[PDB]
Amino acid sequence: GTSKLKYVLQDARFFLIKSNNHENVSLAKAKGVWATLPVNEKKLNLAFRSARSVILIFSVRESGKFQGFARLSSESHHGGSPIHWVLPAGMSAKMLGGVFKIDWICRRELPFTKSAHLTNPWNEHKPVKIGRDGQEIELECGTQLCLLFPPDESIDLYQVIHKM
Numbered sequence: 001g002t003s004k005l006k007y008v009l010q011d012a013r014f015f016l017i018k019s020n021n022h023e024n025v026s027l028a029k030a031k032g033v034w035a036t037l038p039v040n041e042k043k044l045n046l047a048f049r050s051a052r053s054v055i056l057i058f059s060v061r062e063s064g065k066f067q068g069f070a071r072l073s074s075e076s077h078h079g080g081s082p083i084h085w086v087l088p089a090g091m092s093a094k095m096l097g098g099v100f101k102i103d104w105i106c107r108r109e110l111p112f113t114k115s116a117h118l119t120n121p122w123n124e125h126k127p128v129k130i131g132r133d134g135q136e137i138e139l140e141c142g143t144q145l146c147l148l149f150p151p152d153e154s155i156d157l158y159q160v161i162h163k164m
């Protein structure tokens with residue numbers, strides 16, 4: 001049922017993540033880590049320190065779908081086990097240096113055709129599928145976006161709730 005997910009999403013802030021490739025999402029789904037460019041890294045840190053939950057909703061460029069969503073469990077962290085990211089054209093390993101730890105909540109896909117009725121007030125009320133990497137999604141729009149995803153049987157919400 002939705003009681004457990006709604007408990008996670010309450011008072012959450014939501015950010016769209018746009019990956020240039022599928023490989024780094026595969027990597028991120030397995031290890032439970034993410035990294036973004038310095039502008040979004042600051043914004044996710046600021047949001048982490050201040051919101052009860054910070055939810056990342058992932059979408060691979062040109063895929064036409066979201067691939068899942070995850071909640072930050074830590075702020076940016078530099079100087080650990082180097083992540084073998086597939087680096088898009090024009091990017092340092094150090095640009096993706098602040099590694100966020102994330103707990104995935106859903107790793108299943110949601111096509112854009114199923115989100116078409118949802119628009120984001122914080123992005124001029126365009127459909128929520130429209131946005132750049134890091135675009136923040138108003139509370140209700142992002143809550144509804146996350147409730148559209150199918151239940152993931154590989155995921156147990158228990159560890160997320162125990163650390164919230």
Ligand SMILES: CNc1ncnc2c1ncn2[C@@H]1O[C@H](CO)[C@@H](O)[C@H]1O
Pocket residue numbers: 018019020021024034035036037085088096132133
């Ligand atoms: C591991 N982290 C990442 N992996 C793949 N693409 C990313 C990414 N972080 C940002 N991007 C995207 O790649 C573009 C190149 O800067 C950005 O505008 C984002 O849309």
